[PDB]
């Protein structure tokens, strides 16, 4: 799926107006990926942890060629993919993907 | 933000109708848990790509007093690097955690 099938996942499971599936899927990175740029934690169910965190601010290796460094960390994206998907992954399609 | 918050940041960015913020983002984690799970290539525009791959693990017992079994049951739901929330977090003030 993808911000545009997703629109279809909640023009279906939703449907009512398909009020801006592809309105508010285009928002939703807007707000996904913004809202980490606007300072906010989003939390999906369990599985998206939306959350920015720093962990670097620096990377010019030293007068050779490959000894980069990195020393300060600015704002990053601690969120992850949690087991919500996984333990409903383990439940569809996971031996499918086995075999 | 949650499976509320973002409902609003969808329903304002919506507002044609809060079709049913409730029930989209409600089912847009169980759709995006749940299609992951599906077994499909679950994604957001160019930043986030939730992938599920049959995988597995064990040898952490259960039934007894845990700590010593021999199972294998774990899909991968894998994931992306949207640089677009992470490029958008230079626009918080990614140095300002830097420094």
């Given at each position: 799926?993808?911000?545009?099938?997703?629109?279809?996942?909640?023009?279906?499971?939703?449907?009512?107006?398909?009020?801006?599936?592809?309105?508010?899927?285009a928002?939703?990175?807007?707000?996904?990926?913004?809202?980490?740029?606007?300072?906010?934690?989003?939390?999906?169910?369990?599985?998206?942890?939306?959350?920015?965190?720093?962990?670097?601010?620096?990377?010019?290796?030293?007068?050779?060629?490959?000894?980069?460094?990195?020393?300060?960390?600015?704002?990053?994206?601690?969120?992850?993919?949690?087991?919500?998907?996984?333990?409903?992954?383990?439940?569809?399609?996971?031996?499918?993907?086995?075999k």
């Amino acid at each position: 799926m993808n911000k545009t099938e997703l629109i279809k996942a909640i023009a279906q499971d939703t449907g009512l107006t398909q009020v801006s599936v592809s309105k508010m899927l285009a928002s939703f990175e807007k707000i996904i990926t913004e809202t980490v740029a606007k300072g906010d934690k989003v939390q999906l169910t369990g599985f998206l942890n939306i959350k920015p965190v720093a962990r670097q601010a620096r990377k010019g290796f030293n007068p050779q060629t490959q000894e980069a460094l990195e020393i300060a960390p600015s704002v990053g994206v601690s969120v992850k993919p949690g087991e919500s998907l996984k333990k409903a992954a383990e439940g569809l399609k996971y031996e499918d993907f086995a075999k």
